[PDB]
Amino acid sequence: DVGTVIQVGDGIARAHGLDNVMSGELVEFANGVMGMALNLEENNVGIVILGPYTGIKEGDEVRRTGRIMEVPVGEELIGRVVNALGQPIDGKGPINAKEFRPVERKAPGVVDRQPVKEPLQTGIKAIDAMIPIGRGQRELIIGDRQTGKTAIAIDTIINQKGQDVICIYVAIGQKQSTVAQVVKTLEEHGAMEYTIVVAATASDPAALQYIAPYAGCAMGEYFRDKGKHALVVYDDLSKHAVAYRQISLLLRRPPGREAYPGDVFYLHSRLLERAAKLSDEKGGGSLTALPIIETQAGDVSAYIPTNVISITDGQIYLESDLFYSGIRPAINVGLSVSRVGGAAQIKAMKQVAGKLRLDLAQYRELQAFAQFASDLDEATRAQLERGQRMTEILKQPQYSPMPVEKQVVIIYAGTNGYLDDIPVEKVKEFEDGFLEYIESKHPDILEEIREKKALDDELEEKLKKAIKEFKATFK
Amino acid sequence: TRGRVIQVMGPVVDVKFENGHLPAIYNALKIQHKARNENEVDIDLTLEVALHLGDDTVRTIAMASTDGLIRGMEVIDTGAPISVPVGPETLGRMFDVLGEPIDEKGPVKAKKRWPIHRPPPSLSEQSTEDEILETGIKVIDLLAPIPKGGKIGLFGGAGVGKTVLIMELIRNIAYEHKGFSVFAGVGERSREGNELWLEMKESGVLDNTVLVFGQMNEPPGARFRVALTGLTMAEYFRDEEGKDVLLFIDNIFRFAQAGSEVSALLGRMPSEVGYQPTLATEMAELQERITSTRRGSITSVQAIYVPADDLTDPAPATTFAHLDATIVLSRELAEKGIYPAVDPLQSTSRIMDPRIVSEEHYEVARRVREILQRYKDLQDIIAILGMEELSEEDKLIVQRARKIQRFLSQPFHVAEHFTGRPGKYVPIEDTIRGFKEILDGKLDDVPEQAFYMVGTIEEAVEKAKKMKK
Amino acid sequence: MTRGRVIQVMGPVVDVKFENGHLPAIYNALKIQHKARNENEVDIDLTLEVALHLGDDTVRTIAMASTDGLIRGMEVIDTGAPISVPVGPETLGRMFDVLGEPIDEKGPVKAKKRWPIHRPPPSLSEQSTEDEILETGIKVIDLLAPIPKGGKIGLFGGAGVGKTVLIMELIRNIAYEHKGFSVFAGVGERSREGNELWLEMKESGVLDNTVLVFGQMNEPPGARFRVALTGLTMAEYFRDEEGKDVLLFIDNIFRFAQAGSEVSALLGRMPSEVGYQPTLATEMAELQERITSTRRGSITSVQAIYVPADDLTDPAPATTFAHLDATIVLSRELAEKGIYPAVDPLQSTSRIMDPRIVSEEHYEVARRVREILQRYKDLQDIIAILGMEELSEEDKLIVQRARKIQRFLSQPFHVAEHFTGRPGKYVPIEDTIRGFKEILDGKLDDVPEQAFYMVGTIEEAVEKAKKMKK
Amino acid sequence: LLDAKASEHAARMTAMKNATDNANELIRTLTLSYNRARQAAITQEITEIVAGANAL
Numbered sequence A: 001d002v003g004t005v006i007q008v009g010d011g012i013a014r015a016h017g018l019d020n021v022m023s024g025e026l027v028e029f030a031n032g033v034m035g036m037a038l039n040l041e042e043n044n045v046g047i048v049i050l051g052p053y054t055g056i057k058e059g060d061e062v063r064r065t066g067r068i069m070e071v072p073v074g075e076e077l078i079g080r081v082v083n084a085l086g087q088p089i090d091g092k093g094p095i096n097a098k099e100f101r102p103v104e105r106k107a108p109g110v111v112d113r114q115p116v117k118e119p120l121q122t123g124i125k126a127i128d129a130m131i132p133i134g135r136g137q138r139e140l141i142i143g144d145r146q147t148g149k150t151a152i153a154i155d156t157i158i159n160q161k162g163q164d165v166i167c168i169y170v171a172i173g174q175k176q177s178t179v180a181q182v183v184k185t186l187e188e189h190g191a192m193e194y195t196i197v198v199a200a201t202a203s204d205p206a207a208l209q210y211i212a213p214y215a216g217c218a219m220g221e222y223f224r225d226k227g228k229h230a231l232v233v234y235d236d237l238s239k240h241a242v243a244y245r246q247i248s249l250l251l252r253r254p255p256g257r258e259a260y261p262g263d264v265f266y267l268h269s270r271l272l273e274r275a276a277k278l279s280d281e282k283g284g285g286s287l288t289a290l291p292i293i294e295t296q297a298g299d300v301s302a303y304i305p306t307n308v309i310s311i312t313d314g315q316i317y318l319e320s321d322l323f324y325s326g327i328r329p330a331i332n333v334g335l336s337v338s339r340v341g342g343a344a345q346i347k348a349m350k351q352v353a354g355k356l357r358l359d360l361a362q363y364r365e366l367q368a369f370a371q372f373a374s375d376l377d378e379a380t381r382a383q384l385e386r387g388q389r390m391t392e393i394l395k396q397p398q399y400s401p402m403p404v405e406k407q408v409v410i411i412y413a414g415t416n417g418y419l420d421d422i423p424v425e426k427v428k429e430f431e432d433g434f435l436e437y438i439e440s441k442h443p444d445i446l447e448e449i450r451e452k453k454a455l456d457d458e459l460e461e462k463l464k465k466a467i468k469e470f471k472a473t474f475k
Numbered sequence B: 001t002r003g004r005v006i007q008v009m010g011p012v013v014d015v016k017f018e019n020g021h022l023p024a025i026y027n028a029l030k031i032q033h034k035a036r037n038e039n040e041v042d043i044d045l046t047l048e049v050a051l052h053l054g055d056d057t058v059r060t061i062a063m064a065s066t067d068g069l070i071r072g073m074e075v076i077d078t079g080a081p082i083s084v085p086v087g088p089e090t091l092g093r094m095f096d097v098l099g100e101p102i103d104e105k106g107p108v109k110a111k112k113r114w115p116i117h118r119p120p121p122s123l124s125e126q127s128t129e130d131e132i133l134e135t136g137i138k139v140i141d142l143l144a145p146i147p148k149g150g151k152i153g154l155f156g157g158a159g160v161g162k163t164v165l166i167m168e169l170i171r172n173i174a175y176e177h178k179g180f181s182v183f184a185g186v187g188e189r190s191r192e193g194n195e196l197w198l199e200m201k202e203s204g205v206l207d208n209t210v211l212v213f214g215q216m217n218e219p220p221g222a223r224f225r226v227a228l229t230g231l232t233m234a235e236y237f238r239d240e241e242g243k244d245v246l247l248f249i250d251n252i253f254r255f256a257q258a259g260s261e262v263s264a265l266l267g268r269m270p271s272e273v274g275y276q277p278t279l280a281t282e283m284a285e286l287q288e289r290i291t292s293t294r295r296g297s298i299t300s301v302q303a304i305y306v307p308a309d310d311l312t313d314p315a316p317a318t319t320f321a322h323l324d325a326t327i328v329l330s331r332e333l334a335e336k337g338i339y340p341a342v343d344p345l346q347s348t349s350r351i352m353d354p355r356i357v358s359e360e361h362y363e364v365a366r367r368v369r370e371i372l373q374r375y376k377d378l379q380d381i382i383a384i385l386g387m388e389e390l391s392e393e394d395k396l397i398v399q400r401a402r403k404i405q406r407f408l409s410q411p412f413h414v415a416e417h418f419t420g421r422p423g424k425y426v427p428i429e430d431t432i433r434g435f436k437e438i439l440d441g442k443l444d445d446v447p448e449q450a451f452y453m454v455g456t457i458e459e460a461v462e463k464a465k466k467m468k469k
Numbered sequence C: 001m002t003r004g005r006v007i008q009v010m011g012p013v014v015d016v017k018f019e020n021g022h023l024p025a026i027y028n029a030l031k032i033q034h035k036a037r038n039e040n041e042v043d044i045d046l047t048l049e050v051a052l053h054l055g056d057d058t059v060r061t062i063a064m065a066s067t068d069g070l071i072r073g074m075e076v077i078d079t080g081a082p083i084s085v086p087v088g089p090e091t092l093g094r095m096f097d098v099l100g101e102p103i104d105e106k107g108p109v110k111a112k113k114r115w116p117i118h119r120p121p122p123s124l125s126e127q128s129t130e131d132e133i134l135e136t137g138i139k140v141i142d143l144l145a146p147i148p149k150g151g152k153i154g155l156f157g158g159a160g161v162g163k164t165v166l167i168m169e170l171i172r173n174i175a176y177e178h179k180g181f182s183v184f185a186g187v188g189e190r191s192r193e194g195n196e197l198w199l200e201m202k203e204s205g206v207l208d209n210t211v212l213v214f215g216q217m218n219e220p221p222g223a224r225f226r227v228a229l230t231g232l233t234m235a236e237y238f239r240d241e242e243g244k245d246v247l248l249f250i251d252n253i254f255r256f257a258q259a260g261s262e263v264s265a266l267l268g269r270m271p272s273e274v275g276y277q278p279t280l281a282t283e284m285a286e287l288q289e290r291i292t293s294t295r296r297g298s299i300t301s302v303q304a305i306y307v308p309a310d311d312l313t314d315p316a317p318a319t320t321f322a323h324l325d326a327t328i329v330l331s332r333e334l335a336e337k338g339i340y341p342a343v344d345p346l347q348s349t350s351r352i353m354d355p356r357i358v359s360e361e362h363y364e365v366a367r368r369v370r371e372i373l374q375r376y377k378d379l380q381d382i383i384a385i386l387g388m389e390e391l392s393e394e395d396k397l398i399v400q401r402a403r404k405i406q407r408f409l410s411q412p413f414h415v416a417e418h419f420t421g422r423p424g425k426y427v428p429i430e431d432t433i434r435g436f437k438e439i440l441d442g443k444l445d446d447v448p449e450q451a452f453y454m455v456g457t458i459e460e461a462v463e464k465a466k467k468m469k470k
Numbered sequence D: 001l002l003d004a005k006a007s008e009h010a011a012r013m014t015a016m017k018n019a020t021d022n023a024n025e026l027i028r029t030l031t032l033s034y035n036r037a038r039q040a041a042i043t044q045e046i047t048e049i050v051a052g053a054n055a056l
């Protein structure tokens, strides 16, 4: 169970001895720092260091712990900020968790699963109506830097207060000032009462940046095995991939496409397949996932992006030209899809917008044609007018989510065509004015839709009678 | 005469056989270990031989995770390759890479087992009869007819419609065919496999089907050998029983990718775009076995993933020489909401010969490609010169090409959640009849928005009346 | 024995063997002091930094000065700690090398306290979260990319686009309102500019409140790599042991990454991407996490980043974007058109551009400016062929206002008086917001587009138009 | 009208001449950029190949 260090450099070490070490085991240096054995050659063990390595010298002793990589889990982690390992980083004392679980685990099998049929409400009009997310689904947020990727993930976590959901935020490669600002934003909105924050900052050893998403996954699956729903966010998987390239090149493993290793697809596949909706036999639990990716110059075609887009159950693309031109949130409807879309919605939302993505694609195409055609037949004029109104109804400012019962009432009025006379600039004022009138005059419709979760014929007459009272004030 | 583990390098493992009695290439090895003390872990693993080294040593690829492996353990040589159960007792079951059941229905009691590596048929015993196989899909039934007993390839990038097209073909061809069906989910999502299994259980189609999985979360060793396990089961129905069979495969690119992932660790020099020096050889040993012999036929539908919408990447480029029909899915049509998004210029098959198809089928298909090829070059000009500067023949071609391109769209039965429509089937005579009226200019008056997600051409006129025109 | 022997020399890199069990730690500073014993030898005083433990009592070390003249078998001393630099108020008004030795010729510095160059950053509990605008008087920065007090500002650009002219103008404005200790680190740049700056500081009297460290283009890779850290260890003492606010100016953060790449190739490490080191993001983060504000006091830093070609996708420019609170990108097209500073209004952004931090009037004007500039970049590819004769109504009016807006972002700097006879100008935030608001509203649609070139305030455009009479 | 139609055809002739010249200039500048990209891709690809072969 004992060895001696032979090489030390850049957070990587080589040891002699350690005959009984297992692939993936934990090892301790004389300094008290931990390391993980990732290579087992005929004469030398290759060790990845899990902390500061400037105190480890050649000829120092290394000892076998006798345990695989393990992290502590429980409900007591809620409202706490923690390291990639089982250690607190906030000024709030010890964690006192009840049990420990391995960092590497196999995903649920084909028969252990169930189809996704219940929503994960984001409170964002474009995502809930066009790109719906269900509990157990894996959804990707993608774009270049400074496009709103973090804002969509945090707005989603803030919208989980009413529901019986636990959220996990994993920060990989992020700057410490941003982690403190995220934690304080979560505290102002009260989200810290039902969330966990796992952080491995940029100045942290690459080895800890690797383990951060897997440890965040091990903490999420604990709630899922009991029967409770859980959500996990990964702030940058592109920074996790960049981190993975360093130890593999320092351990001298051969490169591949770009300079990344051959195991790059397997890295993110091992992680993202643990997110599932389990069957009634397993307790019906659900682990949802929201990975994030940064792509240079806003190009979809690259090694790390295409690997992850090929693993998830959909994706949300954010475009900087949409952002600089007034479209917020800056989501491109043509490149964004949900592989579970339609089943992950309440019946009222399917009845109201089951065909919105296809219709909003006819208009997106017609924009490129109409600007050079200079001819507009009546059927094209009618679609340009409706498409403009729907693109305005989908705009939404920060930190102001829409409950589903309000989202199905405005989209019902827009898709039925009641907004025909209302001028384009006026639509914004009509939406805000009409939604405030619903919460005043006969609020029965708003409450009845919330309980039933379906639009019937009574709720259609009740609503068609209401939409005509406000329009009677116009020209 | 046993062996010992010497090096553990992620998926690759090295084993030394001291007696000199080394295992042959592709043989299967077993590691079964009981923990001696509290520090160790119990292990159950299979590894296949890949290469013979010099000092009584062999390189092997593991079929499951190598965590917990210790140098100096004991390895048993089975004496043969990975042997999978074969016969009628495999029908209505689900399998792993090793041919073990992944469902909870109990053991399989099949009297025979066959190795996943077998020599392909010889030139002297192949067959090549030609007939039209109907799909009920407007694009495929007209522009790229499926040859019965032939290989079909669906090419596309991420999220263009490949799996939604495979699923519609299984719910059309297999639902209109007597004989066995086989499906292999090569390196795909384990959520999609579950939904497919439930659809089969409901419909009753499992009784005539076999399923093999070994999904995305499995190591590289399992992700490349899964296609061979599904193939050794479809071969028994052709060679021993004589029945015709369908073989459906999603993501054959994961088989090529998984071979590249393990190639560097074995010690092979790299090749173009970061692929193994044996790409064409490895895809040929898979594709050359899925053929129609004198005894029976294997019709095959395969989905191919194009890494960045670039057909010139080594894996998609190596695949094109083996197909009998090729269908290319383009994101350009998907972004416009035109589904299934089949490219009407790049799509072709071995059956588009004037001697095989009807006269009007051949004429309508060639006229569709010419009008769309003319429109393709002309639409680019319109963006800089403007539509007012072009001639009347060009304006007529633009107006008709827009309607043709939209009438190629159809609502699938498996797409109800994504389309908000029930789904429809169109027979070959209606596909030919419908496209002819558009080409001849009969419906020049109908608006271009009356062809999205429709079925038969009669519906477009009814839909235009509902649109008050 | 605390001493070692030289076993190999390979340009900047050297290998030293020690006695069994008595080896120096990673980052320890070693000394070679040799006096020639025969006419064939040469005399050397040199220092090296440990980088790797290589096995067999051997260690690999980078050198801080030229290795020409080293012989295998020379004796090496172990200091027992990293490169330690003198620190305190006595460093004010002085200039130094990478080793903390003075290059001023004013004599020694009182060695009261010495700090090692390698130390950890402030933890999450120690950091401070507050945002306020630091005003610089430059129109494009104050409107589209406002500076966060206590944060990091990055100026990206290619060869000859104006990064040094922009930093010199920033020192003449921010360091004249900050009213606290200032620090300048010259990393891999011209020694002629360093000399001009030092002389200007003396005539202005500003030297009494500043510290200067230099590592120039002629220095070996080991020195170009450690100079940014020497300037930072001195700037850090003032915000931690005195509690004062500090300014840190770094003229090239790109030469720090480039020097790491050059020495990495010689250490025996496998390459990555465009031949860079397999430790690029970790080496840059260790430097940039230390450049942060805490509850005691704040560090505000201005950095100029070189781009290898007119390509921002290069590994070094690409990794630094994640660490900045404000980012300013300089484009060659604006510089060749004569628009200075050549800041791109669509690529430049700041973390302070949120409705909560800036005034409502500022937020509307800044967002309305980027919409017109993005719309004109969409028309740009078609007008390159057909021209503006085909355009009608709003698209034509949008280019008419976009021309005026693009020119009103140009400003005559005080440091530029040596290139053009025009006097420099400082523009307050209330004047930039009012001027752009009137240009956007259309109150100045009658004035010609040539009347907004190199001006300060909107009233100057009115008199410049009146001078022309057109 | 005679002068107006003649001047219209003269104006369009000059407009089309300039449009064609602007497009021909854009084609050579793009062609040179494509040749730089072509050569850059080949040297990068060959160096990734040789680095991998040297490592193995």
Ligand SMILES: Nc1ncnc2c1ncn2[C@@H]1O[C@H](COP(=O)(O)OP(=O)(O)OP(=O)(O)O)[C@@H](O)[C@H]1O
Residues within 6 Å of the ligand: A144, A145, A146, A147, A148, A149, A150, A151, A152, A294, A328, A329, A330, A396, A397, A398, C350, C351, C353, C354
């Ligand atoms: N809907 C919106 N309306 C207005 N501003 C928005 C909106 N969404 C995001 N923003 C703003 O744009 C910026 C987005 O920062 P965010 O972190 O979300 O982007 P990012 O892609 O993750 O960038 P980074 O890589 O730096 O983290 C912030 O200033 C944010 O407040």
Ligand SMILES: Nc1ncnc2c1ncn2[C@@H]1O[C@H](COP(=O)(O)OP(=O)(O)OP(=O)(O)O)[C@@H](O)[C@H]1O
Residues within 6 Å of the ligand: A310, A337, A338, A339, A340, A341, B156, B157, B158, B159, B160, B161, B162, B163, B164, B165, B305, B339, B340, B410, B411, B412, B415, B418, B419
């Ligand atoms: N026939 C269709 N009708 C409507 N929408 C469709 C149709 N076909 C595909 N889509 C949409 O496009 C998405 C494509 O998902 P799909 O599973 O088919 O991806 P894919 O091409 O198979 O990619 P991958 O192989 O990686 O899974 C669907 O989830 C759906 O949103």
Ligand SMILES: Nc1ncnc2c1ncn2[C@@H]1O[C@H](COP(=O)(O)OP(=O)(O)O)[C@@H](O)[C@H]1O
Residues within 6 Å of the ligand: C157, C158, C159, C160, C161, C162, C163, C164, C165, C166, C340, C341, C413, C416, C419
């Ligand atoms: N405000 C300005 N007015 C006029 N010329 C300028 C201005 N800013 C930059 N330049 C010119 O552009 C170049 C900028 O030099 P410098 O700032 O040293 O370039 P670099 O970006 O490489 O550091 C010089 O030729 C200088 O004269």
Ligand SMILES: [Mg+2]
Residues within 6 Å of the ligand: A148, A149, A150, A151
């Ligand atoms: Mg962000």
Ligand SMILES: [Mg+2]
Residues within 6 Å of the ligand: B162, B163, B164, B188, B250
């Ligand atoms: Mg698929």
Ligand SMILES: [Mg+2]
Residues within 6 Å of the ligand: C163, C164, C189, C251
């Ligand atoms: Mg300079």
